[PDB]
RNA sequence: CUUUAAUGUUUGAUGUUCUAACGUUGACCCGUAAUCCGGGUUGCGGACAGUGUCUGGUGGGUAGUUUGACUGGGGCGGUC
RNA sequence: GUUUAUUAAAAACACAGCACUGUGCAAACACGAAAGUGGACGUAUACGGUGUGACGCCUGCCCGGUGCCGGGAGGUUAAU
RNA sequence: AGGACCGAACCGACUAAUGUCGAAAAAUUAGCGGAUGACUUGUGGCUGGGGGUGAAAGGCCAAUCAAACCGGGAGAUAGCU
C-alpha cells in the first residue's frame, strides 16, 4: 500500500515518501494513530501543497516540548515508601499507577502510557533503573529507590 | 381400562385453543385454511 | 469416621458409612441459601445432553465464597456444615465486622479457628494469599485460574496441589492428576488440604443409594440393539467390534483434547 | 446473519462434485470478520461485520464514504 | 567452467521480543431496581487461537444403491 | 428391583462393587448451520464413555493381524 | 435402624378355568407378587418422526411403530393378478 508518512518511522520514515507497507500495518497502527494518511491520486497534490512544510514545524515543536518536559525534574529520582514484608516479599507488586501518580503530584506531569518498566514490576526492594520514553528518539533514565517502612 | 382420551378443559384450550394457534405462523395457517373451507368452528372454543 | 454396619438385611451388608460428629446438627444459614432446581440432564432445547442424570433428593444451594476478597478482616470459624452440592464440607465463618460467609473447610479447621485473607496473612491452613507470597513446595487448594476469577483447582474432598517452581511472573503447580500447569503468580490460593479426606471410603451399599444421589441406571451398549448403539446385536453376547462411544467415537485410549489455546500453560501431561 | 455490511455478500448455495460427478448441496460462506474501524470524523471506533473483500474496499475508498453509503442504505451500523 | 570470499538484492524455514489487529465464559465503571448485551478503563493471551475459500488423510456416524442366469423346487456344486 | 400395554416376568435388563480409558475447567462429551444450553453454579476423593457384575480364592501365555499411544532415519504424497 | 418380615387399601399381573360373532378391540372368578420405597398417585409443564424416550423388549410415542398421524408430489411405479 502506497501511503504518505507524517511522523518519523524508525525503519522507513522519510516525511511523505511513496513507500509500500502492509495493509494491516497501516490500517491498524499508522492511520488510527495519525502517523500516516492514505493517499491515492488525490492527496498527493494536497500533501505537497499544505502538508509539505506547514506541519513540519508543528510536528517538530511536539518533539521540542517533549524534550523540555522530560528535563522538568533535574533530580530524576523517585522514592516511594512501602510496607514491605519481613526480609523481602514486598507487600504487593506495583506497576505504573502509584509511581505515575506520585510523580504527577510532585514532579513531571506525564501520561500513564509514557512510563515503561524494563526490570519487571519492581518486585525486589532496592535501587532500580526505569527507562522513560517521551519520544521515539528521546529516552530518559530515572533511578527509583523503594524503601521498606 | 384407561382410555386415550382423558378430557381436561384447561389442557384442551392451552393446546388447541384460538390463542395457541395465533402464537405461531403454522397455527395461523391452520386458521387460514379452515376459514377458506368455511368451517363453522375455527377451533375448540370453551 | 468410617463405620461398618451390621448385615441385618440385604442392602446393609456392604454399606460403609462416613460419620462426622462435629458436623452441625441443624438447619443451615438461611441468608446464604438459594434454590437449586434440578435439570435431569436436559438443556434449553429439552433434549437429554448428559445421560444417567435424574431424580434424587431435593437440595438447596449454599453460596460458597471462593473469591475470598475480604482482605485484612480477621474471621472466626463458627461451625462446619454438610453441603449436599459438594463432596467437601463447608465452614460458616464470621468476620470481625459482623459478616458471615461460607468457605471450603480444609483438613485442619475446627470450631473457633482463626483464618485470615490477603497478602498480610499467616501460613496456617485456611488463609488465602497470592501464590507469589506462598513459599515454594507448600500444599494449597482452591487455586485461581486468573486474578479474581474465584478458584477452580483442588476443590473436592481431600484434594490439593503442589507448588514446584516459580519462574518470573508465573508459577508451576502439580495437580492431583499428575499434570503440571503454569499459573499466574497474582492468582490466590488457600493453604492446606481440602477436608473430608475419608469421603472416598464410602461404598453406598445398595442400588437405591446411588438412585437418590441423582444417578440413573447405566445400560451397556452390548445389551442394546444395533440401531441404538454401535455395539449390540447378534445372538449369545457377540461383540466383535472395537469399543466406541454411543456416537461412534473410539473410546478406550483415544485422546480427545483439542484446544491449541491453553497448551502454552501445560508443561507435562498425565502419565 | 452471515451478511457483509459493506458489499452485501451473503452465503450462496451450490453443489460439490466428486470424481463420480455425484452432486450434493453445499453452501459457500463469505469470509466475514468483526473489525473495529477508527473514524476521525466522529472520533471513535465503529465495529462492522465485514468480509475480507469489504475490508479491501474500505481501504481503497474512505471509511467515511463507506459509512455514508451504509447510512443511505437505511441500516444502522 | 571446477575450486572460494567482503558490501548490496530476492529471499523462505527457524528463534526471541513488542503491541496496534484479534480473543477474553478476568476485574471495575456506565446505560440499569439487569448473572443478557453494548460502551469505557485496566489486566492477561496475542499475530497464536479462531473463522472463510481451496486441498490431502480418516470417515457404516449418515445416505443412495448393487449383490447374474441356467437349475428335474431353491441352495451347494458345475456350466456360460 | 425393572422388562416385550394386548401369547415370552426369565438365566434377560438394572444393581452396589471392580477395572480400563478420556477430561485442567472457554473440560471431555451431547443437543444446536450459529448464538447458546446441559455437563455444573460442579472442577480429578470430579465428570463422561466402555466392559464386568455382591462377597471369598483368583484372573495364566501371546503384540503376528486390526485398533489405540509415541517416534523419527529414509521413501512416497494434495492444494500452491 | 431396615430398597427388613406377615398382611388390607393401593400398585402389578405368576397359574388355572370361563369368555373368543364375548359383559369387555385382554376382562371376570379362585389363588398369586410388592405393599416406607429404585414405591405409588393428582394437577401442570418439557422432550416431535431418521426424531424423542427407553433398569434395553426393537419396547413405547392417542386401541396404529424395524421409522406415528394428516395433507401434498400423486392418477408414483407395477415385465404381476
From Swiss-Prot, chain A:
Gene Ontology process terms (BP): cytoplasmic translation
GO molecular function per UniProt: large ribosomal subunit rRNA binding; structural constituent of ribosome
Role played: One of the primary rRNA binding proteins, it binds very close to the 3' end of the 23S rRNA.
Protein name as it appears in the record: Large ribosomal subunit protein bL9
Coiled coil: none
InterPro entries according to UniProt: Ribosomal_bL9, Ribosomal_bL9/RNase_H1_N, Ribosomal_bL9_bac/chp, Ribosomal_bL9_C, Ribosomal_bL9_C_sf, Ribosomal_bL9_N, Ribosomal_bL9_N_sf
Disulfide bonding pattern of the chain: none
Modified residue annotations for N6-succinyllysine: 71, 83, 112
N6-acetyllysine modified-residue sites: 89
Entry's family note: Belongs to the bacterial ribosomal protein bL9 family.
GO cellular component assignments: cytoplasm; cytosol; cytosolic large ribosomal subunit
Keyword vocabulary terms for this entry: Acetylation, Ribonucleoprotein, Ribosomal protein, RNA-binding, rRNA-binding
Quaternary context: Part of the 50S ribosomal subunit. In stalled/collided disomes (pairs of ribosomes where the leading ribosome is stalled and a second ribosome has collided with it) bL9 in the collided ribosome contacts bS6 and uL2, while it contacts only helices of the 16S rRNA in the stalled ribosome; the inter-ribosome bridge thus formed is different from that formed between normally translating ribosomes.
Swiss-Prot record, chain B:
Gene Ontology molecular-function annotations: structural constituent of ribosome
GO cellular component terms attached to this protein's record: cytoplasm; cytosolic large ribosomal subunit
Coiled-coil ranges (or none): none
Gene Ontology biological-process annotations: cytoplasmic translation
Gene3D superfamilies found in the cross-reference section: 1.10.287.3980
Name of one Pfam family that matches: Ribosomal_L34
Keywords: Ribonucleoprotein, Ribosomal protein
Recorded family membership: Belongs to the bacterial ribosomal protein bL34 family.
Assembly and interaction partners: Part of the 50S ribosomal subunit.
NCBIfam families: rpmH_bact
Entry protein name: Large ribosomal subunit protein bL34
Gene (name only): rpmH
Swiss-Prot record, chain C:
Residue positions where N6-acetyllysine is found in the record: 241
Pfam families linked: Ribosomal_L2 (PF00181), Ribosomal_L2_C (PF03947)
Record-level Gene Ontology MF annotations: RNA binding; rRNA binding; structural constituent of ribosome; transferase activity; zinc ion binding
Residue span of region Disordered: 27-52, 220-271
Keyword Phosphoprotein: no
SMART domains per the UniProt record, alphabetical: Ribosomal_L2 (SM01383), Ribosomal_L2_C (SM01382)
Recorded GO CC terms: cytoplasm; cytosol; cytosolic large ribosomal subunit; DnaA-L2 complex
Keywords in alphabetical order: Acetylation, Ribonucleoprotein, Ribosomal protein, RNA-binding, rRNA-binding
One BP annotation, GO: cytoplasmic translation
Source organism superkingdom: Bacteria
Low complexity biased stretches: 38-47
Subunit structure: Part of the 50S ribosomal subunit. Forms a bridge to the 30S subunit in the 70S ribosome, contacting the 16S rRNA. Interacts weakly with S6 in one of the 3.5 A resolved structures. In pull-down experiments interacts with CedA.
Family: Belongs to the universal ribosomal protein uL2 family.
Other facts noted in the record for this chain: This protein can be partially replaced in vivo by its H.marismortui (HmaL2) or human (L8, from the 60S cytoplasmic ribosome) homolog.
Protein name per UniProt: Large ribosomal subunit protein uL2
Native source organism of the sequence: Escherichia coli (strain K12)
Gene: rplB
Swiss-Prot record, chain D:
UniProt-listed GO biological process terms: cytoplasmic translation; ribosomal large subunit assembly
Key word Ribonucleoprotein present: yes
Keywords carried by this UniProt record: Ribonucleoprotein, Ribosomal protein, RNA-binding, rRNA-binding
GO cellular component labels: cytoplasm; cytosol; cytosolic large ribosomal subunit
GO MF entries: rRNA binding; structural constituent of ribosome
Gene3D superfamilies, per database record: Ribosomal protein L28/L24 (2.30.170.40)
Pfam families according to UniProt: Ribosomal_L28 (PF00830)
Matches recorded under InterPro entries: Ribosomal_bL28, Ribosomal_bL28/bL31-like_sf, Ribosomal_bL28_bact-type, Ribosomal_bL28_sf
Source organism, top-level taxon: Bacteria
Family per record: Belongs to the bacterial ribosomal protein bL28 family.
Subunit structure: Part of the 50S ribosomal subunit.
Name this protein carries in UniProt: Large ribosomal subunit protein bL28
Gene: rpmB
Amino acid at each position: 500500500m502506497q501511503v504518505i508518512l507524517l511522523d518519523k518511522v524508525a525503519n522507513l520514515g522519510s516525511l511523505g515518501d511513496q513507500v509500500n507497507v502492509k495493509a494491516g500495518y497501516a490500517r491498524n497502527f499508522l492511520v488510527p494513530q495519525g502517523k500516516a494518511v492514505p493517499a491515492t491520486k488525490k492527496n498527493i497534490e494536497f500533501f505537497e501543497a499544505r502538508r509539505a512544510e506547514l506541519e513540519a514545524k508543528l510536528a517538530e515543536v511536539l518533539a521540542a516540548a517533549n524534550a523540555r518536559a522530560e528535563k522538568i525534574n533535574a533530580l530524576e529520582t523517585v522514592t516511594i515508601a512501602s510496607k514491605a514484608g519481613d526480609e523481602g516479599k514486598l507487600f504487593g507488586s506495583i506497576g505504573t499507577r502509584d509511581i505515575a501518580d506520585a510523580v504527577t503530584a510532585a514532579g513531571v506531569e506525564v501520561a500513564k502510557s509514557e512510563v515503561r518498566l524494563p526490570n519487571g514490576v519492581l518486585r525486589t526492594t532496592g535501587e532500580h533503573e526505569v527507562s522513560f520514553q517521551v519520544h521515539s528518539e528521546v529516552f530518559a533514565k530515572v533511578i527509583v529507590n523503594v524503601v521498606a517502612e | 381400562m384407561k382410555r386415550t382420551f382423558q378430557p381436561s378443559v384447561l389442557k384442551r384450550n392451552r393446546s388447541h385453543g384460538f390463542r395457541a394457534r395465533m402464537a405461531t405462523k403454522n397455527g395461523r395457517q391452520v386458521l387460514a385454511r379452515r376459514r377458506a373451507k368455511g368451517r363453522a368452528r375455527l377451533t375448540v372454543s370453551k | 469416621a468410617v463405620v461398618k454396619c451390621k448385615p441385618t438385611s440385604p442392602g446393609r451388608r456392604h454399606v460403609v458409612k462416613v460419620v462426622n460428629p462435629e458436623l452441625h446438627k441443624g438447619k443451615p444459614f438461611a441468608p446464604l441459601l438459594e434454590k437449586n432446581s434440578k435439570s435431569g440432564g436436559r438443556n434449553n432445547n429439552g433434549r437429554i445432553t448428559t445421560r444417567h442424570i435424574g431424580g434424587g433428593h431435593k437440595q438447596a444451594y449454599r453460596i460458597v465464597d471462593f473469591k475470598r476478597n475480604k482482605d485484612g478482616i480477621p474471621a472466626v470459624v463458627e461451625r462446619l456444615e454438610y453441603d449436599p452440592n459438594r463432596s467437601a464440607n463447608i465452614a460458616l465463618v464470621l468476620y470481625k465486622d459482623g459478616e458471615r460467609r461460607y468457605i471450603l473447610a480444609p483438613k485442619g479447621l475446627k470450631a473457633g479457628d482463626q483464618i485470615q485473607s490477603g497478602v498480610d496473612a499467616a501460613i496456617k491452613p485456611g488463609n488465602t494469599l497470592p501464590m507469589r507470597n506462598i513459599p515454594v513446595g507448600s500444599t494449597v487448594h482452591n487455586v485461581e485460574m486468573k486474578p479474581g476469577k474465584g478458584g477452580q483447582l483442588a476443590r473436592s474432598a481431600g484434594t490439593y496441589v503442589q507448588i514446584v517452581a516459580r519462574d518470573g511472573a508465573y508459577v508451576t503447580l502439580r495437580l492431583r492428576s499428575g499434570e503440571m500447569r503454569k499459573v499466574e503468580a497474582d492468582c490466590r490460593a488457600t493453604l492446606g488440604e481440602v477436608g473430608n479426606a475419608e469421603h472416598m471410603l464410602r461404598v453406598l451399599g445398595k442400588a437405591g443409594a446411588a438412585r437418590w444421589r441423582g444417578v440413573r441406571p447405566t445400560v451397556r451398549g452390548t445389551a442394546m440393539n444395533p440401531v441404538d448403539h454401535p455395539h449390540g446385536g447378534g445372538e449369545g453376547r457377540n461383540f466383535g467390534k472395537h469399543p466406541v462411544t454411543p456416537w461412534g467415537v473410539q473410546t478406550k485410549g483415544k485422546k480427545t483434547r483439542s484446544n491449541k489455546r491453553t497448551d502454552k500453560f501445560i508443561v507435562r501431561r498425565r502419565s | 446473519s452471515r451478511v457483509c455490511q459493506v458489499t452485501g455478500k451473503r452465503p450462496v448455495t451450490g453443489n460439490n462434485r466428486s470424481h463420480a460427478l455425484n452432486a450434493t448441496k453445499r453452501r459457500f460462506l463469505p469470509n466475514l470478520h468483526s473489525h473495529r474501524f477508527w473514524v476521525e470524523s466522529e472520533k471513535r471506533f465503529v465495529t462492522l461485520r465485514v468480509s475480507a473483500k469489504g475490508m479491501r474496499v474500505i481501504d481503497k475508498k474512505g471509511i467515511d464514504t463507506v459509512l455514508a453509503e451504509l447510512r443511505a442504505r437505511g441500516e444502522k451500523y
